[PDB]
């Protein structure tokens, strides 16, 4: 079949900057003057969206900052000026021969200004406790860049191995990330201590921020 390769696989760029993505096809997709390469945009949780078809024609309804060029085996998608809404994975697709094939995808992220996270901590609910398990949750909200560090402490003992964390995709509203960390303990273990703390490290923090609660008192 025809294999398509995009480059880069990943990029990050300042708002407003010109962004170009390349697609190379293993064989020519040209047919009688036309070049059958297509581009899609796929945002988190949504279907891919057709931007460009036949290599250069802008699909109805798509903003004019998107343009396509190329011919034969080499094609380029250009965003003249990257807007916050344009966070997505971009795919090329050849329509010259079946099986119709897609590139491996290019992730485009917006590089915004540094923003510190807002930090929140949540005790487990009483409702959950009766099931025999306790989940403690730490929220890091609306920050940039994506790199952040969460440390769990239980009566000042550093917790390792009993947490998992998750990060949202970049929010197009403001180009920030949010992060969730969950500490899981048995009910018996949870009831054996008093002080639960979440210590957060991040570039926009001049020193680490800590949010905590007492399981007893409040």
């Amino acid at each position: 079949d025809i294999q398509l390769t995009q480059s880069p696989s990943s990029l990050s760029a300042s708002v407003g900057d010109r962004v170009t993505i390349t697609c190379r096809a293993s064989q020519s997709v040209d047919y009688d003057g036309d070049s059958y390469m297509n581009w899609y945009q796929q945002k988190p949780g949504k279907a891919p969206k057709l931007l460009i078809y036949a290599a250069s024609y802008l699909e109805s309804g798509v903003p004019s900052r998107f343009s396509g060029s190329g011919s034969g085996t080499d094609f380029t998608l250009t965003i003249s000026s990257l807007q916050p809404e344009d966070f997505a994975t971009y795919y090329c697709q050849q329509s010259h021969e079946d099986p119709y094939t897609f590139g491996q995808g290019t992730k485009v992220e917006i590089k915004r200004t540094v923003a510190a996270p807002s930090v929140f901590i949540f005790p487990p609910s009483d409702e959950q406790l009766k099931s025999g398990t306790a989940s403690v949750v730490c929220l890091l909200n609306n920050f940039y860049p994506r790199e952040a560090k969460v440390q769990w402490k239980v009566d000042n003992a550093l917790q390792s191995g009993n947490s998992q964390e998750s990060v949202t995709e970049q929010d197009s509203k403001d180009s920030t990330y949010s992060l969730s960390s969950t500490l899981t303990l048995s009910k018996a273990d949870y009831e054996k201590h008093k002080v639960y703390a979440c210590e957060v490290t991040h570039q926009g923090l001049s020193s680490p921020v800590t949010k905590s609660f007492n399981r007893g008192e409040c």
Partner: protein, 222 residues
Amino acid sequence: EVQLVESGGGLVQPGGSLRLSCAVSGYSITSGYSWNWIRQAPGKGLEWVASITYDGSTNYNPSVKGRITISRDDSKNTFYLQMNSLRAEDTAVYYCARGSHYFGHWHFAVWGQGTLVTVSSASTKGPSVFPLAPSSKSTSGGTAALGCLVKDYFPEPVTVSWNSGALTSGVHTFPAVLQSSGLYSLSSVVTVPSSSLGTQTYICNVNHKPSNTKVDKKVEPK
């Protein structure tokens, strides 16, 4: 406008078979140049698997061909994907899509929303939904955070919405994590004015279709 709505997704046993449907509205299925199934697995990118043309001609990707059938039912304005002898490799989100009458046809302007197919021996399991309670009190009577914890379900996906879709701003719904139990766990949070905690009702909407579980959980200050 033209809309494609998928059904048939969910959990499937290894060796078992799947039947997906794509219901079309605002458009006659007979007017499409072609209708297509396209799937998307992690690290697999997007893969076209089948097409049916306006005259009834079918075509398949050899990477799955022989154990795959595309068909249509003109009178229900619906078309179908049938696959059997399913493997783990076949776990993916499946999209239906419409081809074009122009410019070589085989680009896809109109897509359904996608439905997830999970191939596993495990059984379905509905989630527990727990409150992430707010503040105790606000900091500086400022912005407060609240949420819902959706724990111990299988397979994916769950959807979460707040106040029946009337609250979208400031909402974050995290990707699920797979726990070592083999069950998924997810939290959803929203940030709101703390002066509203006493006057505004906040309800998270949790739906796990594979287990037929819907829950509405009010979250408020403890």
